[PDB]
Copies of this chain bind each other. A is one copy, B any other.
Amino acid sequence: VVLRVVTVLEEPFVMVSENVLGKPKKYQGFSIDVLDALSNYLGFNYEIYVAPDHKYGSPQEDGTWNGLVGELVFKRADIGISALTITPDRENVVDFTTRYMDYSVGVLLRRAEKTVDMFACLAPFDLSLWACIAGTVLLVGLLVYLLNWLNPPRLQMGSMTSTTLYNSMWFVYGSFVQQGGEVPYTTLATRMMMGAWWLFALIVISSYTANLAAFLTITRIESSIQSLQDLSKQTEIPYGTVLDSAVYEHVRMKGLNPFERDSMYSQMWRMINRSNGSENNVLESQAGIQKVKYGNYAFVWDAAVLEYVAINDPDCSFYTIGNTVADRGYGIALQHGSPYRDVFSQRILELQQNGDMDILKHKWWPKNGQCDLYSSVDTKQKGGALDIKSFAGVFCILAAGIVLSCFIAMLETWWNKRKGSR
């Protein structure tokens, strides 16, 4: 048996890899691997040639088709295999096998260095717990003050050991922060209160040290943006696609429908459509990829392609997010009424369900390698010292207290100049 195959060049599905007299002598790629795995079982010989316009094709105004589909409609080639997308407008004129790989829409994003968070000091306790602690300090100072009046100590006559609220609360704060000398309160009530206060304070400060020790070990390669929803919700990074591409038309026709209400699609179209699409789109996939590599941009394209580029960019400078996608799958096209639809399909099924196809897929999309596709940090950082940019928040907390001491010292003489009441 002899078969003539039409293809379109696209990495990593179909590439030329040897040339003689300027003509392609060898093809390779995942779709070529599928074709060869079919040939080695069914025994057919194949001759591959490249479609002249390098387009998949569209229904012409006369009802014909151009491109690879055209080459099938005119029956100039027997079988067409490439990064086709199974769609019913195409199947209306040519047959398709069962899909051998699921299609998906992905985005390519440049990696970035870890941000310097400003308030690493506040992290160990939830931002409401500090309000609970400050309120507990105040309430314990009030409880100490009422305690000293419900049951009073016995004291030196006229001594300031009859501690006013101000002096009573000072001991509660100072003892909380592990400062100050002997607590002057001798009575069993006040001691029994202060010793449990000391136990609370020491447990709080241990827990602070212990949980700061945990952010200083968790902080690793985990931080990333990992969904289309997030990309559609943020606005700092512009995103787009190739103009008039099937991806463009897909995202458009998803987003324009007002009865579809997953707003991610409409937010994507609302970004893409700006200035007739000229704001965020590019003429070519390579231009988009380079714009991502050397600018603030993200490129929306075939997830399989972008994952292949991210795996085979030697810098690991890109990262990418994956998505579960239906309605589309790569497959093999045939002339309408061709019998091999009922010959290839069962072998494609055997390959998928035996797991044999997983070898051919791994051969081009390796499960592990140099580049961790779903992680985006300065991965060289095992750990580090605390920088001035980092610990800034605590110098701010101090400078705020300093400001409040300057305010009070300045104000106390607007008090002192009240009425002459020295």
Residues of A within 8 A of B (CB): 86-88, 91-92, 95-96, 98-99, 101-102, 121, 123-129, 132, 136, 140, 143, 147, 150-154, 170, 173-175, 177-183, 187-222, 224, 235, 253-254, 257-261, 263, 266-267, 270-271, 274, 314, 324, 326-328, 342, 345-347, 349-350, 352-359, 362-363, 366-370, 382-388, 391, 394-395, 397-398, 400-402, 404-406, 408-410, 412-413, 416, 422
Contacts and interface: CB of A to CB of B under 8 A. Distances in A.
Contact of A177 (B202, B219, B261, B270): B202
Contacts of A179: 175, 178, 180, 183, 194, 198, 201
A296 to B, nearest CB: 16
Given A99-B98, A195-B177, A200-B401, A151 B387 contact: no
A50 B31 CA distance: 41
Contact of A387 (B126, B394, B398, B401): B126
A11 to B, nearest CB: 18
Majority SS of interface residues in chain A? helix
A67 to B, nearest CB: 19
B202 A205 contact: yes
A402 B327 contact: no
A174 B266 CA distance: 61
A73 B395 CA distance: 78
A362 to B, nearest CB: 7
Contacts of A405: 143, 147, 189-190, 192-193, 196
Given A179-B180, A189-B405, A207-B212, 6 more contacts: A136-B395, A174-B183, A179-B201, A206-B212, A207-B386, A260-B355
Contact of A355 (B177, B212, B218, B257): B257
B213 A219 contact: no
A320 to B, nearest CB: 15
A62 B355 CA distance: 28
Contacts of A369: 263, 266-267, 270
Nearest to A88: B349
Contacts of A202: 177-178, 205
Contact of A92 (B125, B182, B346): B346
Contacts of A350: 88
A177 B199 contact: yes
Given A174-B195, A383-B222, A422 B154 contact: yes
